């Protein structure tokens, strides 16, 4: 859990 | 999101989005498993409400998603309506969601872990993004 | 108007309950936690939605979207159901089902 | 409250009888259910 599979990307 | 940013598509893959028998989009959730999301008390969910898994572009007719049916609701009884404390809601599914890529669940902490002040977070949603 | 199509996501501090009351008074309770007021807000539709923080690589659901300002203030922080308060009847509801 | 009673979307506030500046994040497709003095309900939708 908690470990997307698609990176998050944020600014 | 007021000020939101828009996300990379399948980055947030517990994030559902909840939807009516009429079709529009009330509330988020998040999958904490296969079997379970969790969302909002006030959202006042109903079972023939849907649970919509695996999507970005709500808008788009290609992407697929995942159409969950909802088994039962449990709104934490606790919830007061004139205080909106204990604002949850579980909700079981019908349709169990299956994992992978762009489905899956989010960790759920511990009712001792302490999250200090000032600690950057990240909140998702298909919100308005001007009110 | 009309939800925005695309999934939004945006970075905010948690505030301690004590910094939260400056806005909200008396309305936060113990089982409540909130975020924001640093230009960045939830607005209608983001409800039930989550509220992730880090702890040992992994993103865990702090907090769920719950109220806040009615227009959506930037200024102003959003309220959010405190997660580890409510955790243990999430537990209980897991086990019974 | 003050010189009058308020309505159930309405808080005491200096005396006077105010609509609420609390809404719950849900999104209404008809708004939020409003009350008998004109007052949006914070987490009931119309």
Redesign the interface.
């Known amino acids: 859990?908690?470990?997307?599979?698609?990176?998050?990307?944020?600014? | 999101i007021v000020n939101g940013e828009e996300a990379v598509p399948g980055s947030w893959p517990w994030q559902v989005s909840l939807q009516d028998k009429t079709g529009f989009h009330f509330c988020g959730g998040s999958l904490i498993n296969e079997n379970w999301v969790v969302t909002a008390a006030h959202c006042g969910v109903t079972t023939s409400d849907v649970v919509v898994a695996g999507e970005f572009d709500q808008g788009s007719s290609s992407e697929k998603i995942q159409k969950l049916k909802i088994a039962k609701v449990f709104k934490n009884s606790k919830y007061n309506s004139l205080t909106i404390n204990n604002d949850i809601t579980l909700l079981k599914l019908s349709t169990a969601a299956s994992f992978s890529q762009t489905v899956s669940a989010v960790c759920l902490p511990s009712a001792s872990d302490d999250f200090a002040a000032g600690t950057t977070c990240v909140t998702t949603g298909w919100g308005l993004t001007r009110y | 108007a009309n939800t925005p199509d695309r999934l939004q996501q945006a970075s905010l501090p948690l505030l301690s309950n004590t910094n939260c009351k400056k806005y909200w008074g008396t309305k936060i309770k113990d089982a409540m936690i909130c975020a924001g007021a640093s230009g960045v807000s939830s607005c209608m539709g983001d409800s039930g939605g989550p509220l992730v923080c880090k702890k040992n690589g992994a993103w865990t659901l702090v907090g769920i979207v719950s109220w806040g300002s009615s227009t959506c203030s930037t200024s102003t922080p959003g309220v959010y159901a405190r997660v580890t308060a409510l955790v243990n009847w999430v537990q209980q509801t897991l086990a019974a089902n | 409250c003050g010189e009058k009673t308020c309505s159930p979307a309405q808080v005491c506030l200096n005396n006077e009888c105010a609509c609420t500046a609390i809404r719950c994040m849900i999104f209404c497709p008809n708004g939020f259910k409003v009350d008998e003095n004109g007052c949006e309900y914070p987490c009931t939708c119309a």
Do not use: D, H, K, T
């Not at chain 1, 859990?1 to 600014?11: D, E, H, K, M």
């Open positions: 859990c908690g470990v997307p599979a698609i990176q998050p990307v944020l600014s």
